[PDB]
Amino acid sequence: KEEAIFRSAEMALVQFYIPQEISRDSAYTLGQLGLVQFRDLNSKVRAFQRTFVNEIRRLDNVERQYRYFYSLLKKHDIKLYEGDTDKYLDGSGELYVPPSGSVIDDYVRNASYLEERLIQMEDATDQIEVQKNDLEQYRFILYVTGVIARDKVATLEQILWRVLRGNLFFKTVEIEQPVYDVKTREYKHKNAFIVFSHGDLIIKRIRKIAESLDANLYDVDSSNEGRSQQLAKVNKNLSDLYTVLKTTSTTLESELYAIAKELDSWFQDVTREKAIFEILNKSNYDTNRKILIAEGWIPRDELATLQARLGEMIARLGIDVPSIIQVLDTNHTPPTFHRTNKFTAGFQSICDCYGIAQYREINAGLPTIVTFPFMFAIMFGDMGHGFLMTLAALSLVLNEKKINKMKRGEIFDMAFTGRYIILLMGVFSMYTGFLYNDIFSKTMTIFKSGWKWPDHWKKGESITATSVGTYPIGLDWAWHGTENALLFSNSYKMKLSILMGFIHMTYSYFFSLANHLYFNSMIDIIGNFIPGLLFMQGIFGYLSVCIVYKWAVDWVKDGKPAPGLLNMLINMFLSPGTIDDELYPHQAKVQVFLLLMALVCIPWLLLVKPLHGDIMIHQVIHTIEFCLNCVSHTASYLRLWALSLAHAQLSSVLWTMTIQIAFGFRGFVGVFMTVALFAMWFALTCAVLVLMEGTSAMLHSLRLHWVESMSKFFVGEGLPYEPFAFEYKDMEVA
């Protein structure tokens, strides 16, 4: 008992009589329904004068602490561990949820406590890292004492020998293990440096040059007893340092591993209140005011169920005061909605990419669901390429459960929603193959034998064919390989393209009548549809009836001349004096009535609508564009033919010189050569053919629907329907 994709759903503007006290629960649940928007209210004042500023700022601050958790966690060797559970509940959960409440303030305090504690912990950890790095070189030690990179010791010795013009004692020793120097920021090799001098100024110069050479120094003891005592004190402090670093590392890793389990769910939980308060921001809940009053967009067929859910929550929340809602006088234009399922959501979205529907008009998505795949297929043709792309579509259709919860990225991207679009255009490609009779380029011959070329043939004679019958399903396989095949097929599919295009125009234009009739407007009907329809039929549909009559009569047996393939109308453009080769008795004569009707219709179309300042100026442009679009689009329908023939010829040429040379027949070397040739052929066909040409035809039919069909009836642009809800925020926004 709900609406469908037939048109825009029945909109509604209901009035939210939200009690002030229960407002947070009401907003939370109402957003949980994933069913309501909120009309933009009290937006006339700047964004930093809202009543919600303090909760917004504290929750955004909280999201910042959560991001800091995620950043340090990614720095550490640990990841999330509870992503699957949280997303499923919040995605399409029922009316029952565990709302937070004061646990929001609990979360805020918890996050602040966690930052103070782990900031202290990180300061302790890097301070003690500096401490152990300092002592590690000091412990390795045991005049001049110091350590420096082992590779630069030679230059240090040279600069020592040169800085003082004489000589000085020197000693060095390589270190056992590299030291992760803070200045170097890497575990570079090091070596001890020892020198000696007499003067104190020489010692100071040694200090200065060692500091310039990034060589740290230590206060060693010349006396053996003093050095031993210093080493003992260093070890005594260092043992406590190892113990404390081990303990603090254990505590940090334990608490991070514990917090990682809930952090992923905590983020998607806390993301709710940001939206909640941004939404109730529009409600205008003044502090002095009580019984909050607000409005939002709902589907009319869901008012009863949303009221029932709100009452159930109020009973669950214990709020004694009842909740009420009333529908306003919807003077303002409500948004357009389409309760599309996964079967047709892709088609609807692709259709509305051009423009959102009018408030209640006949949404163009529904006819496109089928026309777009078939318009593509009549452009695409081949069995084999369509079949491989249908397999590719199945790759996403069958694994829809898995792919839905895995990042689209650049592997699929917009194809994430294209699983069902590609499937339907693929099955229509199957049909077009049955009716063009070409698995890839090569024609198949299951059906009954067509043209019977004469049974006696010379070695290289030119042989015509006999119309012994009509091939039942599709183009006759006998046409393959013949010198007239291109002409026959091209004439055929020109006429097919123009006929199908005219049928598409008629079906799309009838939608304008349906839309106006649903809106119960008559002047627009009589001023646009009937004149426009009679014009478009009286020229182009008259051409269509011309061509169908032209096939219908067996011309040569009929005896009277057969007009050219696409001749009669352009011959008629001259004058009512039909030149020659009449289609039927008075068929080329009576059509002057249609022509005069159209030419006397054009000024009526020009004047009827304005006759209720710039309305006439708009309507004259409207008539001009109507006629020009009509002619241009009816011509544009040749694009189906164009890419059908392009695909057929490309398939032919690739097949003739990328596969099946049959070289080295019955030879193992020939087997290898044909294996490589087939691999290259399949790679070329897949990549080039399906990707390039299939998406090309996709785009051509897509534009076809966007203008040729849509613009005939779809004019109104309305507001989109974006209700208040979201599934999860596990995308790790930064």
Partner: protein
């Protein structure tokens, strides 16, 4: 009606404001009356002390 609902909400808000104003006025009047009563009781206590002094 929508206008009727808005008018009803406005009337409810006005009634709530009137109740709050009546509460504030009652608070002020009670404070003044209790101050007067305390003054009277203190005058009675002073008169009792004066009577005790006269008896003494």
């Amino acid at each position: 009606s929508q206008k009727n609902g808005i008018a009803t909400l406005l009337q409810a808000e006005k009634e709530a404001h009137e109740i709050v104003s009546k509460a504030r006025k009652y608070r002020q009047d009670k404070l003044k009356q209790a101050k007067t009563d305390a003054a009277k009781e203190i005058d009675s206590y002073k008169i009792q002390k004066d009577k005790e002094l006269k008896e003494f």
